[PDB]
Amino acid sequence: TRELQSLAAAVVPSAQTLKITDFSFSDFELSDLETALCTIRMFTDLNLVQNFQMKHEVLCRWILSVKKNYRKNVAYHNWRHAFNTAQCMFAALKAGKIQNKLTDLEILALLIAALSHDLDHRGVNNSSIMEHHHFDQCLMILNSPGNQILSGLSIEEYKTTLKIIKQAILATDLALYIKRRGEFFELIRKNQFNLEDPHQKELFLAMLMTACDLSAITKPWPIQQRIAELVATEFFDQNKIPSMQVGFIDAICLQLYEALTHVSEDCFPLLDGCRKNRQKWQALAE
Numbered sequence: 227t228r229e230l231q232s233l234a235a236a237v238v239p240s241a242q243t244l245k246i247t248d249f250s251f252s253d254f255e256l257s258d259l260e261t262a263l264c265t266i267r268m269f270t271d272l273n274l275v276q277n278f279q280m281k282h283e284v285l286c287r288w289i290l291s292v293k294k295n296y297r298k299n300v301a302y303h304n305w306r307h308a309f310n311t312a313q314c315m316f317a318a319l320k321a322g323k324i325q326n327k328l329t330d331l332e333i334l335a336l337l338i339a340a341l342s343h344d345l346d347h348r349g350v351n352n353s354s355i356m357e358h359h360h361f362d363q364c365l366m367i368l369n370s371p372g373n374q375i376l377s378g379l380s381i382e383e384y385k386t387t388l389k390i391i392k393q394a395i396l397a398t399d400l401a402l403y404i405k406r407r408g409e410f411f412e413l414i415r416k417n418q419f420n421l422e423d424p425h426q427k428e429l430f431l432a433m434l435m436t437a438c439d440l441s442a443i444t445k446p447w448p449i450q451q452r453i454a455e456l457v458a459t460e461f462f463d464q465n466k467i468p469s470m471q472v473g474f475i476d477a478i479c480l481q482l483y484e485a486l487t488h489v490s491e492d493c494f495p496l497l498d499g500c501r502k503n504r505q506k507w508q509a510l511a512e
């Protein structure tokens with residue numbers, strides 16, 4: 227309750243002051259409290275606090291609960307990753323201009339899913355069955371006394387939001403992503419992609435989740451190097467790395483950020499950042 231008072235009492239600077247609109251954003255300089263404030267600012271500027279009548283102290287407690295149920299002892303899959311995933315979702319909605327393509331309920335659900343998609347992760351070396359666990363954690367927090375940020379939704383809105391959240395979190399299973407992306411790229415190829423169709427909307431949301439989840443691969447080189455270190459620490463500690471990164475960028479990332487740019491030209495900086503990182507890793511590969 228110490229940390230709650232300080233957080234509930236604090237003033238929240240603008241999105242601009244907090245840099246959370248930049249695709250190249252980094253959290254290394256930030257304290258836990260500051261990531262909490264950034265998260266509040268994300269809900270606020272996406273109009274979520276207004277439109278769904280969230281009570282300040284409930285939102286605060288909810289963020290603290292989420293943060294608390296990530297394990298600090300895990301090198302990469304921890305609160306900072308979740309936080310960064312949500313900041314990328316925010317950036318893509320705002321600067322990437324995806325916002326206007328989605329409903330308020332969709333946006334509410336993506337933001338929540340982004341923050342919650344890896345809840346209670348124990349590290350890759352301890353083991354969509356895991357994604358079912360992350361969503362289960364998400365739901366438990368959403369239903370805890372004092373943490374009910376969805377209380378202002380009608381029962382109908384509430385069910386629709388949980389479904390989107392669940393799908394969103396399950397979508398972060400890279401196997402599901404590989405399974406489903408074929409259709410997405412194909413649709414883009416033929417310039418047939420259409421957000422008005424429910425099936426394609428849901429598919430887009432899945433792709434968007436993966437794009438944010440992997441967003442570290444798009445960061446300015448000094449930052450990417452740093453995160454790759456965290457990832458390697460988790461993979462191996464809990465010379466072949468540069469070629470691995472290149473394989474990962476080629477196999478998983480490039481096409482995704484390419485498609486995403488086709489959906490919205492303003493998401494280009496993610497693609498651009500990803501390409502530059504490939505250059506850097508490719509060079510080290512030799």
Ligand SMILES: CCCOc1ccc(S(=O)(=O)N2CCN(C)CC2)cc1-c1nc(CC)c(CC)c(=O)[nH]1
Pocket residue numbers: 400439440441442443453454455457458461467470471473474477478
């Ligand atoms: C930096 C040390 C090792 O990095 C990697 C090595 C191999 C692979 S991978 O060949 O695509 N693959 C390895 C096995 N697994 C199912 C995950 C995917 C991904 C990664 C990788 N995964 C991730 C996701 C955890 C990230 C964060 C965006 C990353 O920078 N690299």
Ligand SMILES: [Mg+2]
Pocket residue numbers: 343344398
């Ligand atoms: Mg995960």
Ligand SMILES: [Zn+2]
Pocket residue numbers: 307311343344398439
């Ligand atoms: Zn993740």
